[PDB]
Each structure stands twice: as structure tokens, then as C-alpha cells.
Symmetry: C4
Subunit: 331 residues, 4 copies
């Protein structure tokens, strides 16, 4: 083995991230303005815009979930608050019309009680929200939810980074599989634990297990630019979950911060020291203030539309068949 | 597949850019001063110097096109102005002698009317100037022009980044094919849309479809140094189109700008916010003031001559057969 | 040969360092808090925490060795001091309970006399501490020690960077093999001599020679983050030796230094100019003050525990079977 | 072809530079102080230290050539001065004892007359000093010199970067072949012409043509650290020519320069604007003042000795058989 040792499988793959690849242009009859951006969030739920906001307490509470649903996407309400308040935020969303909304639950003690309270409040999507879903306890929670409320509510499981982990969540009954171990902008899992999987390769591997069963993949974390959304979808994901890109908006939780004449909002991992107040696996940071969500989503969808035009993708399903070129460091 | 998924074609190639390669020296009887720099712009038109200026409103109007033609190259007049003014700039060029001149048209509503006005004014080259030429509408415009004015005017089509796209433009009747999707210095297509193709690989692929039909390839965008011109030509291109390298000259549009004691000129993408006043795919920037065009062209041709000496290339056609070494990040 | 010459073996391998790889998550029933972090330092000695402190005079004297042993690891006392003082530091450690302790000796003139004095003082581990252990003199010292005091004391030999060198130390009777030629944070061997081996590949190669003989590998140098500890162990090492990560602690030798409002401690190679007062192969530097050792070790073990959870490793022996993904520059 | 086009030979090799590789440690009975650093400069001339100084007017005049010869190396007198002064500098060297000395000549008009004047003055080595030696005029100059003064004077030819070019110089009668097109620290050939060859690969290729004929290779340019000297020799070179590393010494031409409280000396390419007062292929720069040459040479040889110890190389001929590991960007 050229890299050392006698075992070819020790280093199992070469992991690519968004920056490692570009979409190749292809024959196109598609204009950006005419492309259909709708896509499956879960087996049953289709969104007009393939974007959901992260279940983080500096990204998504009721105001963000409302704005996301109106923009044609969806919010997933964070779970770093008492059950009653989370359920009350769900009802607040529903009070603003027939809006789609999701909410995160864990696999802890109150997790099941949390899930029932959220169902009572009328949630559409339950997101089993863990650092590592390749675990019997997580798979059981997914399964128990799907068997109990599966008729009324779609159940998302995450996060995974391998084909085998995605396959297990599919077996357990997940209506969608969320991919991302390591890539988050505020994530330090890679330096603290030494663990991760570059996101383009993780999506390709998860899609290989999920697509044959008709289960959509949510690409979660590491998206910095509107172009990364197109890359993630072309890699086979059906939607993208955004944290950093939405944390700077007016609709996110938290106040404006003025630093050296420029405006910011605070953005922090749910595994950061302050978010837990296990060693921390996230940082507490700041992102530039970006203004209204509707504005950000427009640019983001604008970039996606451009990619669909370049690749001749009339739909997201067609974009999922596009090809990449791998680039070098010089790129 | 080592990078993920089960489909070897998902990541179709490894894309190289100018910085990824160097020209290998070879047996030479050629002195830099004795090399022949002339080359085909189109099937019928040969330039003394293989350089054309970009169809951008911070690069090429009548003054630049005149100076370029006198230096042995050509200008392509930008189309971000009323038809009448563009045709008037064409006539202005012709008034300064028997000078070669090109002009950009789109595929829009007034595009055909634009083209006829330009023909009337005596244009030599019509450049069908689009972001993505692999499109029936673009191919039809190329074909319609070639069938209508093809005897009197050479028709260039662009831009493309793949073998298949170049082949389609050849089929449609292009007298030259322009290559560049992603590499421009002011281009943000790669981050906004996630789309592009590293320019050395794009040129190799386009040339593979164009050379067998005797159609010249114009390498457009991403050239930072005189050395990149030699690389592009050695990759198989017959000419190079320059934006950033010429935007800082006295002959380009726009005024001098003084910032922190240094002189600059403004340089902006045609897909930038201000150039359109579709989400923006270019930035508005500044480049150092470089002085007279004749000076810049001399250095640029000087570098090209040096490469021809090192590679034993007496002509551009010989340079197109030179070999590369690929370098690593450390280079 | 694509990289030059006609000899495929001239460039014998592709060397990976910690930053080149990530641990892949795997099926897990293991919680971070429930993982067993114990591991073999040598054939006979098992530590509760797989960490030892470097034999450097800005890292380990009696205070550090005591604190390391109490934290479940071990210190290796540096040898840049008279024999009597080193033996006196050994006795000082033993005076603070039944604490494990190691001490470095060379292969020089006083080295044997040093070793005997250390045995007399009750040392548990003798570390034959050289820049290049693939040498008959070093191997003989290892062998002579193992034959003379081998019943009472474990003998470590280092440092090596190849399979063949590790194999020779195993033949010579080493109870553990220490790996690291080039990777130290204060090391300039790579720029001064041009010599080295990236640490992940060096560990894989050493383990290939050591594991089949039941000899543990100590990964020494280049560890910057808690994640690197998990990577080194997953590559096959049984423990990690730390210099820079521990040099900033209260328990390390040396005073506090205040520079531009921030607190530091000095940290220097044993091959640096000042440490020898052969051209220098280390620098004299500064590291941020980190506070108590117990605090640093907690974070470090915390990160290791996280990795064990992600990889489903209940023990270090299981972690040694985990898989990597290789990442690109973009990562 | 994965990188583009249909021709596998278009990109002929993967070029490695010094930073791409490290020397692997190997079984050693060699102590740094006991290694034999002597090596062939040319077929007939062996130096005690395998280092020569560049033929540049900010590196080598009579004072440097004297100091180099006394340190066991040699200087090559630059040729950017009238013939009479160069010959007078040669005689000045000889006046300081039986010191070895070389001198550069070109292939120009006065080049032959220059060479004869230098022979008259008692030069030992004539260095045919060109940017591109793969040229009939250069090869003829080498041959004419070897046939005319070949009994009394060794003739070096350079520079080359390929196997074929090295082979041609061997055929022409060169007593040594100098390698380096592109790598010089003050060289801009790579950006101006787009031409070059990474130096480790260039040395491997040149040695493949030169070693079988017993012709020594001089590695010229790109050496930044003492470690690069060991790498170049291990790649198969017999000596290294140094510019930047020696330009900062007291013995180099030029005055001390004080910039922002630190001492420098000017260092400029022979192809820079000021050195010619063909477009420039070098810059005019500054290097830190390093003090006496004897001091610099000691560190440099010190590093080489260290490498010989690590690789078990008792002689330079043994070092030429050492192995590399290739490293990644992360290294
Ligand atoms: O503290 C943390 N450590 C690791 N990952 C986190 C943490 N907090 C949130 N995440 C994940 O990072 C995603 C957002 O990544 P981003 O869009 O790049 O900022 C979130 O949706 C989570 O999946
Ligand atoms: O706004 C833009 N977005 C993407 N490409 C552009 C834009 N404006 C001009 N270009 C292309 O970039 C080329 C100039 O690239 P440059 O020489 O690297 O500055 C132009 O000839 C166009 O092909
Ligand atoms: O001067 C030196 N040159 C090269 N390696 C050194 C030197 N001093 C200590 N080392 C090694 O570097 C290790 C510490 O590396 P670190 O933890 O990255 O700072 C030590 O345990 C030694 O193996
Ligand atoms: O102007 C120049 N352009 C390209 N190479 C040069 C020039 N001047 C000197 N050289 C070469 O660069 C070598 C010194 O490289 P350095 O030691 O890295 O600074 C010299 O021995 C020459 O072979
Ligand atoms: C994907 O988003 C997140 C990732 C981590 C995180 O926090 C860290 C502290 C955590 O949960 N670690 C952990 C590691 C192994 C296992 I097994 C279980 C948990 C929070 C959010
Ligand atoms: C090559 O030079 C340019 C590139 C882009 C550009 O502007 C952007 C906004 C544009 O045209 N985008 C777009 C993307 C897909 C399709 I399909 C059509 C147009 C302008 C010049
Ligand atoms: C692993 O930690 C260290 C590495 C080097 C070092 O110092 C240098 C000066 C040294 O010992 N060099 C040397 C090189 C070849 C041989 I063979 C022997 C020694 C000190 C510690
Ligand atoms: C190796 O050291 C040097 C390299 C270049 C140099 O100057 C440039 C301007 C030069 O000579 N160029 C040139 C390029 C092709 C041919 I063919 C001939 C000369 C001077 C020294």
C-alpha cells in the first residue's frame, strides 16, 4: 500500500468536499428563470425551494420557520429549550397559515415526550437530530416514531456520513436521511475528535444507499456559497440544510452586534461551550449581518437557477444526474 | 469509485488550470526574436499577434480596438450600449485605416438587428457572445449568421468548456470557438452557480473537437501572466482573449483612480451588478494602471517569444504541439 | 516513472500526515463516557490514559511526571542534566506514591552509567532516546539493557520512521518502539537535513513490523489537536507522546512569559541551539499558557472519547482497527 | 485522458520540486562528523564540499571565488563585465594560492574570445552559461571548447531540464551538465514564459542520461535550505550551485542595505531589467545579510552531514542511492 501498512482498506476512500469539484456545463434548453426548483424534503413532502434552515438556536425559531416556509422552504425548530416552548413555537408557526414546519428531537430521556408534544402541536416533520445516527438507540427512536406517528408525520434521521449508516436509517424507516459529520462551518469535530467525511463524497455514498429506496438525502453543513447548493444537489441530495448562510439574517434569533464599524450576528454550534451551558465540538462565532431572509434566499435560489441553466437541468431530479470535474489545489 | 458512489463517470475528469502546468523546454533552433507569432483568429483571418481584447465595457471600445489592430491583434467591441453607438464605434475603427475589428452580439431580441447594423458598418468578425453556447438558440444564431452573411463576415461562437459543446458550435458553422466557462478574473460563476471547467483541460477538450475540422480555438479568461498565453496556445488554442491584462491600459474605457497613492482603473464583469444596471456572476473591481497598450502587448508578446524559443517552436502551429509537465501544490 | 528517472523505488511511498486523513464514523454502541481509554505503553505496562509527556527540558521534570502519572499517563524525564539530578528526580516521583515513571538515556559515554543510576532510583521505563535508532550502537544499547535489567525495567527504543527500523528494534528486544523522525512542532530536521516521514504513514509502517510481535508503538511528535491523538491510535499506535500540547501547562518547567498582553511559556527542541549550549535541528519557541495539566488532559481525553464513540470503539484495541478517509488540500 | 484531450503524452510527466519530497532514514553506521562530503564537480575535478557559487554579479566575483575554494567548494565568475576584468578576476584568484576557479561564458560574439582570455588567465572550469542549452549553437560551443582546450580545462554546459537535453550535452562532450530551467529564487521564467521543470524531477531525468556516461550533474537553482542540498544530491546530482543562499554573505558583491532596522544585500537575476541595462526573466530583490561565507557553508554542510547520518550514506555516491517519500500539500 503506497500510503503505508499492508491493508488497502485502512484508507477506505478519497474524500471530496465542495471546493474539490465544479459542475460541468451540458447541453441546455433550460433558462434559469424557467427551471423548476421544487424537490422532495421527505418521501411525501415536496418543497418549492430545496432549502431548510438548521435546528440551531442561532438560526431557527418561530420567526425563521415562518419566513422559510413562506419562501417555499422549511424551518426545523431547534430543541435547546423546554418542551413546552418548542411546542408553543410550533403552534405559533401554524397560526401564521398552513405553513410546513419541522422540529428537532434527540434520543435522550425527554426526547419521546418531546416528540409527542410536538405532534400534538401539529408538527409536520420530526427530525431525529444527533451527532452520529449509526447507533441502535437512534435507529430505534426513528423506528418507534415511524411506527407510532408515521401516518401523520414524516420522520427524518441524521446525521450520517457513510453508505452503511444511511442504509441503516433506511431500514429503520426514515423518510429522509440527513448527511453531515464534520463539515459545519462552526464545527470542530474534525479537530477535536479527528472524525469526519468530506461532504461531496458523503453525499455520493449516502445517495448510493438512499436513492434505490426512494429516500431523499438532506445535505447538511459546509455550504458557504449558493454554488455549493447546486453541487450538493448534483451529488444526489434532494435538499440542503443551511446554518451559517441564514444565521446572519434579520429573521434569525439574536441581536445585532457592531464590531469595528461593521454589523454582525452571533452564530454558534449546538456543541459549543455556551450552547451546552462531552467536550465541545463547536465554536461560538459571528457572521456578517445579511438583512432579510427573503433577500438571501433569492440570491441562493438565483445561483441554483444559474446552475440548472448551465447543466440543462429542467428539474432538481435532472440536476441530480449532472456531472462534475474535479479540480486541483491551484483552482 | 474511490471518491464515492458507484458511478465512475459522475466525476468525469480531472481539470487542470494554467497554474497546474509548465511548458517543457525542447530542442530548439529558434531565437525569441525570430519566432513567427502570427496565428488564426478564425478559419480565414490570421493575426500578426495572437491576442484579442475582451468584449467588455471596461476593456474594449473604439480606442482599444484601434490600438489592438495596430499592435497586430484585434478588439471585440462590447455590446452593452445601443445598437447605433456600437455600429458607430465600428465605423470609427474603419475610419482609422484598414483595421480588423470584431463586435459582440447576443441571442436576444435586438441581437439580429444588432448584427445587421454591425455588418452594415463594415465589421469583420461577429462574436456571438453568451455565457453558455451549448444551447439551440445560440447554435441557431451562429448558423443563421453564417448562412446570411457568412461570405463577408467571420462568425465566432462562445463560450464553451466541453468537447461536446465545441463540437456543436462546429456543426453549426462557427469559424472559431471561444472557450471559457468559469475562469475569468472577475468571474464568480464558480462560486455563484458552482459551475466551471479549469481552462487548460477545457482548451484540450475543445481543441479535440475543433482542430480536426480546422476551426481555431480562442482561449478566453483566466490569463494572468504572459506565460499563461504560451500555455493556452500550447494546449491547442490559436489565440487568447484578454480582459484583466488589458483593462489597466490607457486605451481602455474609464478614468484613472487614485487609491492610497497608487493608480488604478476600474474593471468589472459584464455579469456584475453594475454592468446589468439573473443574479450577478461577476464582480466590480480595480486593476493597477499599466500605461500604454503598446507597452503591455510588447511584454506579453515578449513572454510568448521566450516560450517559443524554449520549446523550439518557430510558429504558433509548432507551439500547439509542445508538451507540459504537471506540477504539484508545492510549485 | 511519471515523476522522473527509471527507478520506481526511488520515491518509495506517498507519506500522509495527520492533516491528510479523517476517521470515518462507524456503527457504534459506544458512548464517549463509557469508552475504555486504557492502552499498552510497553509489552507489560498498561496506562489508564494513552498519553506520555516528552523527554524535553521544557516539558518533563519531576512535577510533570507526577501530574502525568496521577492523570493516568506517564512522564519520561529528560536527560539534559547531570545523572545525579535525573536519578534524584526519579526518586522524587516515587516519593509521591506508587507512580509510574520513565527516563531518557542516550547511547553516549555516560549513557550506560546513567541507566544504572536510574535503575537504582527505581525507574520503571528506560527510554533509549535518539534521533535515529536504526543504528547498531542504539540497537546494542537496547539489547544490553534488555539483557541486564530486562526483568525489572521496560526498555523503549526510538525514534524510527520506517518498517525496517521498527523491525530492527523489535529484534533487539524493545518492549515498545517510538515513532517520529521529522514531525515535531519545534523540529527542523525536515528543513535542515531534508529528512523525515509523514507521521500517519510512519505509524502504519512501524505498526506493520511491531504489531505482529506484540510490541506497542508510541506515536511521537506532530500532534497538534486532540483529534490527532485519535488518528495516531487508529493508525495503529498504542500511545502518543506529547511535547507542544503539554509545554504550555503549569506543571511544565519554566516561567510564565508575558508578550503583548498574552501569557506564554517557552518551548524548545532538544536539538535547538540553546538546548545544546552537529548543527541545530530544532527551534526555541513559545506556546500559549494553558493552565493546569489536569485541564489539558481532560480536553485531550475528551476528544479521544468522542472519536471512540463515532467509530464504535469500546477499547483502544478496537480503535486501532478503525478506517480513514484521505482528504484533499481543500479540506 | 483524464486531464483532457486524446493524447496521453501531452502532459508528459508529474514534476516534483524539493518541497514535494523528504529523504527516508535508513540503516546507518555513519555519524554526521564522519561522513565524506567530497564529490565530482566534473569528470576530473573532485571538490571537498559539493557546493559551487552561481555565476551572478550579486554572488560571485574574485572575493567569493577565493572564499568558496578555501571552504572546499568553487566559485564560477560571472560574465557581466568586460573580458579583461573577468580574466583579471581569474588571475586574482590564482594569486591567492592553488585555488580552483571557474568562469562563465556565453555563446555570443565575444564568447569564444572570452573563453580564450580565461584560459590564458589559468581558469580550471569553463561554464557555458545559457538559459537553454538544448540548442545547436550551445552544443557546438561546448564541443569546440572540449576539442580545443579539453586537455587543460573542464567544460560545463547548462542549463537543461530534460533527459534529452542532458543527453545532447553529453554527446557534445560536456564534463558536467547543469540542471535548472525555472527554479531560481529570482527567476520569473515560469510566469513570463510559462516554461520550467520542477527541480527534483529535472535532476532525476538528467541523471538518467548523465550517470550512465559518468558525467556529473550540477543541481542549479531553487535551493532554499540546507535540506534541499541533500535532496538534490540524493536525486542524483553530484554538486549544487547556490545563488540566494550565498548572496547575503559578506564575500558577495554589493553593499549592506538597511531596511526597517534590518540588514540586507541586493540580489538580482542575470535576466532582470537592471542586469541587462528579450523581456526580463528575473527580478531584482533583497536577501537578509548572513555574515561570513564560512559561517553559511558550515551550516549548509552541517545539514548535509545530518542527512548522510540519517540515510547511512558514508559518501556522496552512497547518498545518491537514497530513497524519498513524496509528501502532500498538508506537509
Ligand atoms: O457544535 C456543532 N458541532 C458540529 N456540527 C454542528 C454543531 N452545531 C451545528 N452543527 C451542524 O452544522 C450544520 C450547519 O453548518 P453550516 O451551515 O456550515 O454552518 C448544522 O445544521 C449541524 O448539522
Ligand atoms: O461577469 C462575468 N462573469 C463571468 N465571466 C465574465 C464576466 N465578464 C466577462 N467575463 C468573461 O471573462 C473574460 C476576461 O477574463 P480575464 O481576462 O481573466 O479578466 C472575458 O473575456 C469574459 O469571457
Ligand atoms: O530539536 C529537536 N529536533 C527534532 N525533534 C525534536 C527536537 N526536540 C524534541 N523533538 C521530538 O519532538 C517531539 C515533540 O513534538 P511535538 O509534540 O509536536 O512538539 C518530541 O517528543 C521529540 O521526539
Ligand atoms: O534572471 C534570471 N532568470 C532565471 N534564472 C536565473 C536568473 N539569474 C540567475 N538564474 C539562475 O538561478 C540560479 C540561482 O538560483 P537560486 O539559488 O534559487 O537563487 C542561478 O545559478 C541561475 O541558474
Ligand atoms: C451534527 O451537529 C452536532 C455535532 C456535535 C454536537 O455536539 C457534540 C458535543 C456531540 O454531540 N458529540 C458526540 C460525539 C459522539 C457521539 I457517539 C455523540 C455525541 C452537536 C451538534
Ligand atoms: C462568459 O462571460 C459572462 C458570463 C456570465 C455573465 O452573466 C451572467 C449573469 C449570465 O449571463 N449567466 C447565465 C447563466 C446561465 C445561462 I443558460 C445564461 C446566463 C456575463 C458574461
Ligand atoms: C527526535 O528528537 C530529536 C531529533 C534531533 C535532535 O538533535 C539533532 C541535532 C540530532 O541529534 N541530529 C542527528 C542527526 C542524525 C544522526 I545519525 C544523529 C543525530 C534532538 C532530538
Ligand atoms: C538560467 O539563468 C538565466 C535564465 C534566463 C536569463 O535571461 C533571460 C532574459 C533569457 O536569457 N531568456 C531566454 C529564453 C529563451 C532562449 I532560446 C534564450 C534566452 C538569464 C539567466
Amino acid at each position: 500500500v503506497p500510503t503505508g501498512g499492508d491493508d488497502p482498506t485502512k484508507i477506505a476512500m478519497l474524500g471530496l468536499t465542495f471546493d474539490d469539484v465544479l459542475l460541468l456545463p451540458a447541453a441546455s434548453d433550460v433558462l434559469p428563470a424557467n427551471a423548476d426548483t421544487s424537490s422532495q424534503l421527505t418521501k411525501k413532502i415536496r418543497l418549492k425551494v430545496p432549502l431548510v434552515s438548521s435546528a440551531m438556536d442561532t438560526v431557527t425559531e418561530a420567526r425563521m420557520a415562518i419566513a422559510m416556509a413562506r419562501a417555499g422552504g422549511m424551518g426545523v425548530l431547534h430543541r435547546n429549550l423546554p418542551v413546552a416552548e418548542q411546542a408553543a413555537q410550533v403552534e405559533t408557526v401554524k397560526r401564521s397559515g398552513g405553513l410546513l414546519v419541522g422540529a428537532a428531537v434527540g434520543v435522550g430521556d425527554d426526547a419521546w415526550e418531546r416528540a409527542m408534544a410536538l405532534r400534538d402541536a401539529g408538527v409536520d416533520v420530526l427530525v431525529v437530530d444527533t451527532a452520529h445516527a449509526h447507533n441502535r438507540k437512534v435507529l430505534d427512536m426513528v423506528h418507534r416514531l415511524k411506527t407510532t406517528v408515521g401516518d401523520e408525520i414524516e420522520v427524518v434521521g441524521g446525521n450520517v456520513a457513510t453508505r452503511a449508516a444511511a442504509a441503516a436509517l433506511v431500514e429503520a424507516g426514515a423518510d429522509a436521511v440527513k448527511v453531515g459529520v464534520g463539515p459545519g462551518s462552526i464545527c470542530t469535530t474534525r479537530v477535536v475528535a479527528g472524525v469526519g467525511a468530506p461532504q461531496i463524497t458523503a453525499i455520493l455514498e449516502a445517495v448510493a444507499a438512499c436513492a434505490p429506496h426512494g429516500v431523499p438525502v438532506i445535505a447538511d453543513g459546509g455550504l458557504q456559497y449558493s454554488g455549493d447548493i447546486a453541487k450538493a444537489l448534483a451529488a444526489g441530495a434532494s435538499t440542503a440544510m443551511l446554518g451559517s448562510l441564514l444565521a446572519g439574517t434579520a429573521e434569525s434569533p439574536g441581536e445585532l452586534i457592531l464590531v469595528n464599524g461593521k454589523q454582525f450576528k452571533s452564530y454558534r454550534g449546538m456543541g459549543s461551550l455556551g450552547a451546552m451551558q462531552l467536550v465541545p465540538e463547536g465554536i461560538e462565532g459571528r457572521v456578517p449581518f445579511r438583512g432579510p431572509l427573503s433577500t438571501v434566499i433569492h440570491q441562493l435560489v438565483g445561483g441554483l437557477r444559474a446552475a440548472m441553466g448551465y447543466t440543462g437541468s429542467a428539474t432538481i431530479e435532472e440536476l441530480q444526474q449532472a456531472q462534475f470535474v474535479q479540480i486541483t489545489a491551484a483552482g
